[PDB]
Design an enzyme around this catalytic site. Structure first.
Site, mmCIF file in Angstrom:
data_model
loop_
_atom_site.group_PDB
_atom_site.id
_atom_site.type_symbol
_atom_site.label_atom_id
_atom_site.label_comp_id
_atom_site.label_asym_id
_atom_site.label_seq_id
_atom_site.Cartn_x
_atom_site.Cartn_y
_atom_site.Cartn_z
ATOM 1 C CG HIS A 63 -1.219 -9.489 -1.982
ATOM 2 N ND1 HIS A 63 -1.421 -9.782 -3.245
ATOM 3 C CD2 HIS A 63 -2.226 -9.761 -0.969
ATOM 4 C CE1 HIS A 63 -2.653 -10.844 -3.304
ATOM 5 N NE2 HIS A 63 -3.097 -10.589 -1.706
ATOM 6 C CG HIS A 93 2.443 -2.430 3.746
ATOM 7 N ND1 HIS A 93 1.262 -1.973 4.623
ATOM 8 C CD2 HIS A 93 2.152 -1.776 2.740
ATOM 9 C CE1 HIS A 93 0.591 -1.341 3.714
ATOM 10 N NE2 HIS A 93 1.053 -1.106 2.624
ATOM 11 C CG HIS A 95 3.372 -0.694 -1.658
ATOM 12 N ND1 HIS A 95 2.548 -1.549 -1.868
ATOM 13 C CD2 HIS A 95 2.911 0.093 -0.470
ATOM 14 C CE1 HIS A 95 1.450 -1.256 -1.153
ATOM 15 N NE2 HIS A 95 1.609 -0.433 -0.209
ATOM 16 C CD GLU A 105 1.078 1.134 -3.377
ATOM 17 O OE1 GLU A 105 0.523 1.628 -2.367
ATOM 18 O OE2 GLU A 105 0.583 0.274 -4.196
ATOM 19 C CG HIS A 118 2.132 2.600 2.399
ATOM 20 N ND1 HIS A 118 1.532 1.830 1.418
ATOM 21 C CD2 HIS A 118 2.530 3.878 2.094
ATOM 22 C CE1 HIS A 118 1.460 2.465 0.504
ATOM 23 N NE2 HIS A 118 2.155 3.759 0.777
ATOM 24 C CB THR A 197 -2.599 1.621 -2.564
ATOM 25 O OG1 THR A 197 -1.906 0.825 -1.846
ATOM 26 C CG2 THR A 197 -2.509 2.974 -2.280
ATOM 27 C CB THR A 198 -3.963 -3.711 -1.581
ATOM 28 O OG1 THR A 198 -4.593 -3.849 -0.360
ATOM 29 C CG2 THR A 198 -2.627 -3.633 -1.852
#
Ligand SMILES: COc1ccc2c(ccc[n+]2C(=O)c2ccc(S(N)(=O)=O)cc2)c1
Ligand SMILES: [Zn+2]
Length: 259
Positions: A63, A93, A95, A105, A118, A197-198
């Site tokens: 992911h 991590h 995004h 995000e 994040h 958020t996942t």
């Protein structure tokens, strides 16, 4: 196994089927409306103590990639700000998008950044991460926007290892990375109560989103986009657009630490 992901058939608007909290009351991310966010003079300065941080490893989980830290002692900690107590750094991590016009995000007055970092911390009063995620004040995630322009020299060490963890399930040793090198000058921030958020989308996060983005080079973000969602010897799906879009704010207030 038809599991959650970011494609047309398994992406964010599908997540509710397995994780019904996806339509809950305190979901993340959100759009940050800068005119509606209120200066809160009671908010403290953010205390980021990363001088003893111990990175151990980097992992492609299908992911994103996670840089993991040793969180068996109070080494890298976040406190002050809106937080009560001490939260320990566990992983960071990012995004990112398929192009520089999308990827973050959180958004700021509907503006999307090229990517979002994040830094994930858990509340030491709950003893471990797994217990913390079951609590409404269990986690503190420090969010930092990335824009494309000048290179970030403190990121290059991460960029250069991505070759070794191209596909889902690969990991590499990643010691002595200093995450202070990912921080912007100013620690001005917005804060609101939210979620992971996942999936499992747990409603356990105090979000702290920095106003000042960092700049990374086109060449750095290009290397993010060379990663793979799929495992080795499977058809190639580039890891791009691994961001959930803005979710409804509903009954929540975004506070600013700055005037
Ligand atoms: C099997 O071990 C794991 C691995 C990952 C888990 C997790 C529990 C909840 C979410 N995650 C996360 O760590 C997680 C997911 C999302 C975010 S986010 N993007 O910062 O909101 C932060 C942290 C357990
Ligand atoms: Zn994240």
């Amino acid at each position: 196994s038809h599991h959650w992901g970011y494609g047309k058939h398994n992406g964010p608007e599908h997540w509710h089927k397995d994780f019904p909290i996806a339509k809950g009351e305190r979901q993340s991310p959100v759009d940050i409306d800068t005119h509606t966010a209120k200066y809160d003079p009671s908010l403290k300065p953010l205390s980021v103590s990363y001088d003893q941080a111990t990175s151990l490893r980097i992992l492609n989980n299908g992911h994103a990639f996670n840089v993991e830290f040793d969180d068996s002692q109070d080494k890298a900690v976040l406190k002050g700000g809106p937080l009560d107590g001490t939260y320990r750094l566990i992983q960071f991590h990012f995004h990112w998008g398929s192009l520089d016009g999308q990827g973050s995000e959180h958004t700021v007055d509907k503006k999307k950044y090229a990517a979002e970092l994040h830094l994930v911390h858990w509340n030491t009063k709950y003893g471990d991460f797994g217990k913390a995620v079951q609590q409404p004040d269990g986690l503190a995630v420090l969010g930092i926007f990335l824009k494309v322009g000048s290179a970030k020299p403190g990121l290059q060490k991460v960029v250069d290892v991505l070759d070794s963890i191209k596909t889902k399930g690969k990991s590499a040793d990643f010691t002595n990375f200093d995450p202070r090198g990912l921080l912007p000058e100013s620690l001005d921030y917005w804060t609101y109560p939210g979620s992971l958020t996942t999936p499992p989308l747990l409603e356990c996060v105090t979000w702290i989103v920095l106003k000042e983005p960092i700049s990374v080079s086109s060449e750095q973000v290009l290397k993010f986009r060379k990663l793979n969602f799929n495992g080795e010897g499977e058809p190639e799906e580039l890891m791009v657009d691994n961001w959930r879009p803005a979710q409804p704010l509903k009954n929540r207030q975004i506070k600013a630490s700055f005037k």
